[PDB]
Symmetry: C3
Subunit: 280 residues, 3 copies
Amino acid sequence: MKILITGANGQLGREIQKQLKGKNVEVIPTDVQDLDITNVLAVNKFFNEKKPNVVINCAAHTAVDKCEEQYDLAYKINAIGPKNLAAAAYSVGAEIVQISTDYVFDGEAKEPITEFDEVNPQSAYGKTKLEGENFVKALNPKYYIVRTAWLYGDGNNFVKTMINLGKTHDELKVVHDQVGTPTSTVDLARVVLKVIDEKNYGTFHCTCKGICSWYDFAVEIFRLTGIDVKVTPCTTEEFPRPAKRPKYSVLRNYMLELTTGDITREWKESLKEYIDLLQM
Amino acid sequence: HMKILITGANGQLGREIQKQLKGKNVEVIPTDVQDLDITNVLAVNKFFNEKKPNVVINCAAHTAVDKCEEQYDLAYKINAIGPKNLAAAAYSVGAEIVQISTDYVFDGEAKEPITEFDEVNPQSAYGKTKLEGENFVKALNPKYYIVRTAWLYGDGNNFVKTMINLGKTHDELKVVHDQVGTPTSTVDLARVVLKVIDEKNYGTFHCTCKGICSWYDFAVEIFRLTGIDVKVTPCTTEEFPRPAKRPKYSVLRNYMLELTTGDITREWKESLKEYIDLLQM
Amino acid sequence: HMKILITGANGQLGREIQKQLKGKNVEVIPTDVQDLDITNVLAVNKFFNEKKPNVVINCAAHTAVDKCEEQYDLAYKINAIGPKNLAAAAYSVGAEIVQISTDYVFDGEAKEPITEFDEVNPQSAYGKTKLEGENFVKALNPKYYIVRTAWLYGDGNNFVKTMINLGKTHDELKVVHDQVGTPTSTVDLARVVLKVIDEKNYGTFHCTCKGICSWYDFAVEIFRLTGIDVKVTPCTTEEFPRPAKRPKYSVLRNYMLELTTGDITREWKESLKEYIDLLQM
Ligand SMILES: NC(=O)C1=CN([C@@H]2O[C@H](COP(=O)(O)OP(=O)(O)OC[C@H]3O[C@@H](n4cnc5c(N)ncnc54)[C@H](O)[C@@H]3O)[C@@H](O)[C@H]2O)C=CC1
Ligand SMILES: NC(=O)C1=CN([C@@H]2O[C@H](COP(=O)(O)OP(=O)(O)OC[C@H]3O[C@@H](n4cnc5c(N)ncnc54)[C@H](O)[C@@H]3O)[C@@H](O)[C@H]2O)C=CC1
Ligand SMILES: NC(=O)C1=CN([C@@H]2O[C@H](COP(=O)(O)OP(=O)(O)OC[C@H]3O[C@@H](n4cnc5c(N)ncnc54)[C@H](O)[C@@H]3O)[C@@H](O)[C@H]2O)C=CC1
């Protein structure tokens, strides 16, 4: 089995490579310098020559505020990229996994969101990622769309940010009026490889179990590291940004629950495992 | 030569399809839950990979409408995940899929016969879960047929048998007159399913019998045809409330059939008479 | 060699595609209704199974916009069922499908150039039936190209020829100035169609010429180019009412071209001048 990973140097790309080490698979990791997924001719040629069995697309323009000003570039990476990969995959009979986002929803939900709830993106990042999902489904029947959120792993992320700020500050203000679930790439990668394995095609939410605010997330980070910093809960209005962020983006892993099982862990368990890895 | 898997094959429609395929040049593989549980992805994949059917017709459903409201997870598993599993597994072996669906995808606020190009707006768990099943089938397999039906009777429990049993044990009955649709025989539905497969006339089709009436009118005609002496009284929906919202108006126009190879269904009274005659053998 | 079936091949675009494919290394099979009626499923299936094209380009449509309002069944057959039939028949033989569509899928209430990611909301029979055609094509064949165009002129009847004739027989004309879009030559549309096929750049594309004007501005430029002495007066839509709702604002941005392999269309006045020059040979 030949697996192409795009955006392979990112957080999730790295964790998938790691979980696939020693398995009976040939992994082809690419990032932008090896394969620019926005270029249709390049993508078609690559797939026709390499003939992967699966493509996992971890490439994205994830700077959320920058997407508002770089709408064209967001569409190219977040939407056209997936379109190109899905079709090129189809031409060689390959499956596609497309990683997506909780920003497809408007944030006005009051309870955990399922895969059957209606999308309504209020941001360029959300809109462009959604159009990426729509292309993937339209162009390749052998699709998996895996939506995630608040993702941390081998790369820049909120955990590393908090740690670095916390070491240089005596107090921090962190939003308490935005809720979701911190997710480790370890859990997301396990799920990605699980549905591939089962051929459990479709759209899946995949965040860790539980719920909290960014404030709660920060407090647990500092509890776990021992860093002495006073965190103060604040509101979204106090520190405004170019992109609209959802008040409530808790995803229910419903499709996993209804099929072969929600194997993700409680968010604090995954986070402890990650902090341990870092302090090593 | 042609190999046809039927899921939910012991149900009303499943039985009628088996019957209409007897003696045809096809290998039929009837399954119900104890042979193939369609909610189980691994079991479904393995079954398709080994049997390699050319067509799957999915007649399995969680049709207890009121019970779906209290069993939402189970309704999703049977009414949506099942179809998903069958559509993908079919796609993996190059098979076509027929997915039977429902008028409950609509909100019941229509004022004239509803076409396949009208907008869906399910107000029930049953309708919502059946709709998501349609969505999956189309997303996962380009060789699809979605056939929506309603008020279905045949070889199984149904309104006709219920009315007959009540009517024999009661001097009068109240039946809703403010809900309208069209009584449909599995005979007509099954002829249509097999017709579109035969033509490779892919897409979404409405398939109810011709004409229009209320459940009250349906009951009155049942008792006229059986000779059962029972006074039926028309009533309203508010008088006898249920857990699931039921459409006021769920008349489906068989527009895609009309626009393509012909609406071969019969007027509802004709199909019903043929059914009652079969019963009183 | 590559085999390209063209349906509606005698129409404006069908003729231009044939012309741009002359001398290329492709076998072109032009058909119009008398050779292949696309609304007939059995005929369409048989044709594809025998000819096995690699690509179908569908240029056939019921484009009489006002007449669609009174011929809704026929519009559905040609504008939706035809594409459905072609998309599925193509799929069965591994063929790609290009489906030509319309700015009438939008409601006309936009205030800036409309992209392929904007929401559809047809207010006419023509628009609604063409939209359903799009939906079928994408559902039934993953190797699809939907190319939306507007205000199209070429080798057939069109606004350019109409204006020229009226202008020769009239001293003044009233032309609507409150409906805006962009005049589009089949030369540019055909180049785009053949470009995306060549690239395997699947998806939905807008393809009108660059720029923006009203029908009034279009007329004024036509008469400037031909030298015809006629006074054109700008008017409103309310002054001269028609059965079909027309969009106030139907400027399509060719955004998918811009974001992918390039918007090769020309400025509308350049395309139009080339066309008028061809006409006055
Ligand atoms: N980061 C988060 O909190 C969330 C992430 N996601 C999604 O999860 C997935 C993984 O995110 P991370 O691993 O954190 O992303 P990351 O930002 O750590 O890495 C993304 C990779 O994509 C690459 N890329 C950019 N343009 C490319 C192109 N033209 N061709 C090929 N590669 C290109 C980047 O160079 C980078 O290596 C993405 O699809 C993202 O949208 C969704 C919701 C939240
Ligand atoms: N009966 C009616 O008035 C209406 C029926 N329909 C649709 O018509 C279709 C056929 O209806 P009927 O033949 O009357 O249904 P039925 O209730 O007579 O039979 C359905 C079958 O589903 C089977 N089933 C349940 N779970 C299963 C599983 N996990 N795996 C395999 N089989 C399973 C049952 O065992 C049963 O044999 C269904 O899709 C239903 O949604 C739609 C609207 C109304
Ligand atoms: N005319 C315009 O301003 C615009 C055109 N379009 C679209 O552009 C495309 C091309 O339009 P034109 O080239 O102007 O069309 P045209 O009207 O010049 O030619 C259309 C063709 O449809 C054929 N046709 C009708 N029924 C058929 C059937 N059953 N089977 C096979 N062929 C059949 C006709 O005989 C004719 O050759 C169409 O898809 C149309 O909807 C969209 C927006 C605007």
